[PDB]
Amino acid sequence: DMKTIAIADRTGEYEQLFKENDEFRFVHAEKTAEEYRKMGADKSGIDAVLEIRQDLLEDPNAVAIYGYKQLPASVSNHISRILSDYLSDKKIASYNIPDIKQILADSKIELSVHTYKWSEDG
Amino acid sequence: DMKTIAIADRTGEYEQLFKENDEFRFVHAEKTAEEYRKMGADKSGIDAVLEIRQDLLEDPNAVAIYGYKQLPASVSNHISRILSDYLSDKKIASYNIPDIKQILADSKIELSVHTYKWSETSGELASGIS
Ligand SMILES: [Mg+2]
């Protein structure tokens, strides 16, 4: 069902990328990972915390997710794809072509494909 | 418990993007979305159809996902980003920049976030050394 993930993003660069869907609620971390750990899931109201210490192009090992339980792969797959898209944009945006930022912005396409449940036939 | 999504792409451009995917089970649509609807989930063996009706650069709205049940937002999330990154890159590659395909490929970051359970006894004997 819906999972709640607290985010402790020390950089403030990445926390804005996480939107509140049906499967996922992202909230700002107010306790440390150890404080969440000790309080337990009943009391914290979270399933896991996303911890990011520093610019992930500088050190990609500086991000981790901790949860009370082993989390389904979808959790980290969704967060990883959100971070990977952003970091790929940032790296191409660093490239030494004088108008790369215009080119990237002009070329940017961001679909939100509509998903529907078919009408029932039964 | 991967969902199976049949791809009905009228353009022939986009199925190649889904051959290497680690979240969903993509297959080629052999029937239309409406036929899969009518035959129902037990007959068809799929959960959803990604339907692409036009080049998404000419008409980005010309795509939709249908399922028998409500699908998690993750399915559209994932599919939308894969298509978006492709179309963005296709447009970037049309500018006059030498080796742009190589550069685009080299600039992709694939971060897989390490995920841990915090460590934390009745039927399990302790060590004999303690
Ligand atoms: Mg075309």
Side-chain angles (χ1 to χ4, degrees):
Chain A
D1 61 15
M2 181 193 267
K3 292 261 172 30
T4 304
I5 301 307
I7 297 169
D9 171 12
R10 184 178 295 279
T11 77
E13 190 172 355
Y14 304 113
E15 187 173 334
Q16 67 179 316
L17 292 177
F18 287 96
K19 314 304 185 57
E20 315 285 6
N21 88 31
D22 17 289
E23 331 148 84
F24 301 111
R25 291 277 171 95
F26 290 101
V27 299
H28 188 80
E30 283 281 286
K31 298 287 186 276
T32 66
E34 281 292 296
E35 277 168 354
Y36 279 131
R37 173 213 297 230
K38 282 197 268 38
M39 92 195 271
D42 302 345
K43 285 220 97 94
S44 65
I46 66 172
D47 298 279
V49 60
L50 171 68
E51 297 283 334
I52 303 172
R53 178 186 65 242
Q54 78 181 100
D55 184 334
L56 292 175
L57 291 183
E58 182 67 5
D59 181 354
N61 187 41
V63 48
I65 292 156
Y66 293 90
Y68 303 101
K69 295 183 327 185
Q70 201 229 299
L71 289 160
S74 342
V75 160
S76 34
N77 295 339
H78 181 60
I79 287 168
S80 298
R81 170 107 208 179
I82 285 173
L83 295 174
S84 290
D85 275 356
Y86 177 76
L87 289 172
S88 298
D89 286 353
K90 189 158 175 123
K91 187 166 169 181
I92 181 57
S94 68
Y95 213 84
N96 179 19
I97 293 152
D99 47 357
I100 192 59
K101 291 201 295 196
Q102 175 182 166
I103 286 171
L104 295 174
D106 283 354
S107 295
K108 195 87 179 319
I109 283 139
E110 284 182 317
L111 307 181
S112 281
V113 176
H114 291 303
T115 302
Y116 300 105
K117 181 175 178 176
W118 273 303
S119 58
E120 285 164 7
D121 98 281
Chain B
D1 32 60
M2 247 179 322
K3 12 232 47 140
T4 299
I5 302 182
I7 305 177
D9 173 15
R10 302 194 200 157
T11 77
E13 187 166 9
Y14 304 115
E15 285 212 31
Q16 62 171 325
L17 303 178
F18 295 95
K19 305 259 147 68
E20 285 272 54
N21 192 282
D22 74 343
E23 273 196 279
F24 316 106
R25 197 194 149 232
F26 291 100
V27 310
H28 179 66
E30 294 292 358
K31 268 58 149 74
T32 66
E34 174 59 20
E35 300 176 301
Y36 286 127
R37 190 176 68 81
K38 297 178 157 268
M39 95 185 284
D42 295 304
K43 303 173 67 138
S44 63
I46 64 167
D47 300 297
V49 171
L50 169 63
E51 168 181 280
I52 297 166
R53 304 191 293 278
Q54 186 166 341
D55 186 318
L56 299 178
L57 282 193
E58 302 166 14
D59 183 358
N61 298 312
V63 50
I65 298 156
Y66 305 94
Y68 298 110
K69 320 212 323 184
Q70 191 165 330
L71 289 162
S74 84
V75 173
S76 162
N77 287 168
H78 185 62
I79 290 177
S80 294
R81 289 171 185 273
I82 286 164
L83 286 175
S84 303
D85 284 341
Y86 173 81
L87 298 162
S88 294
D89 284 357
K90 181 160 187 195
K91 285 177 102 139
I92 294 160
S94 69
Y95 285 89
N96 297 330
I97 298 160
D99 280 15
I100 189 53
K101 291 190 227 180
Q102 296 53 222
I103 294 163
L104 286 169
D106 191 58
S107 301
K108 297 301 187 218
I109 296 289
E110 287 269 63
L111 208 155
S112 280
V113 183
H114 294 144
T115 296
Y116 302 118
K117 186 189 159 168
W118 284 296
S119 82
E120 206 173 349
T121 114
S122 309
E124 299 292 348
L125 288 164
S127 75
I129 285 151
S130 303

